[PDB]
Amino acid sequence: SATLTAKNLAKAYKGRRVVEDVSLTVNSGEIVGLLGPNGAGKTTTFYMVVGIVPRDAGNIIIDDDDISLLPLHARARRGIGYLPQEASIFRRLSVYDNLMAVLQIRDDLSAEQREDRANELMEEFHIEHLRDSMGQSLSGGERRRVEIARALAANPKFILLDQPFAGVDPISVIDIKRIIEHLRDSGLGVLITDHNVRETLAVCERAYIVSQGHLIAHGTPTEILQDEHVKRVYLGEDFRL
Ligand SMILES: Nc1ncnc2c1ncn2[C@@H]1O[C@H](COP(=O)(O)OP(=O)(O)OP(=O)(O)O)[C@@H](O)[C@H]1O
Ligand code: NA
């Protein structure tokens, strides 16, 4: 029953406070959403949890252990993983090599197990037919599947998915949701942000809504979708699920 908690995170860039105050929690076995308008601070919040950027204030805690001082690699070894929003594939490496590149980092895997895991990931994500294709040759949706698989290959306890559905077709969204639910069933805590509101809320048990660097709402999917404030500020007053 691990718990990942962020308290009162803040970030400024060149005097502009882009994250004012964001707190959130994700438990093992739980899928949690972070949603909101563009420029609201979602990726910056993920960056601060993962350790990609230093926070200007706030705390990152796993269980009753403040890890705010741990560098990126140490937080990764404590169980935090991140799927970047931006392209993260190795352009010149094949799909197989891209997955092996991450599996090589796994102290908890033998050489034989790494090869097995690579082949399993390719089947689960339906990219076996692209085994030898270079990353730069993949379409956007194909690349995204590889990038999600790479993030899972790290075997995180808490996985932060930054826009896993971007550029993905509807059937592949269903496949990825099913994979996400299997991670949840397996004990992972999942923190997901995406602008496909319907499909993200369908897979979330609860979600935080941020706007202009601050939280404006938190609740179950239906509580969010019927929140008239969220409709006005984020979903649009005429939003239909
Ligand atoms: N390195 C930076 N320097 C200055 N400003 C930045 C920097 N990075 C981000 N910003 C600004 O911080 C604000 C929040 O950025 P962030 O990417 O975290 O928001 P977001 O919620 O993820 O947006 P989106 O939904 O469009 O992806 C933005 O307005 C951005 O212009
Ligand atoms: Na973003």
Author numbering: 1 to 241
What wording appears in the published article?
The LptB2FGC exporter is an essential ABC transporter that assembles lipopolysaccharides (LPS) on the surface of Gram-negative bacteria to form a permeability barrier against many antibiotics.
To trap the ATP-bound form, we used the catalytically dead LptBE163Q protein as was done with CT-tagged LptBE163Q-EHis8 as previously described. The new structure resembled that of LptBE163Q-EHis8, except that it included a fully resolved CTD. The CTD is located at the LptB dimer interface below the ATP-binding sites, and it consists of a short helix (residues V230 to L235) followed by a turn and a loop (residues G236 to L241). Within each LptB monomer, CTD-helix residue Y234 interacts with Walker-A invariant residue G36 and residue P37. In addition, CTD-helix residue L235 forms van der Waal interactions with CTD-loop residue F239. The new ATP-bound structure also revealed a functional interaction between the carboxylate of CTD-loop residue L241, which is the last residue of LptB, and residue R198 from both monomers. Residue R198 is located in the switch helix that follows the switch motif (or H loop).
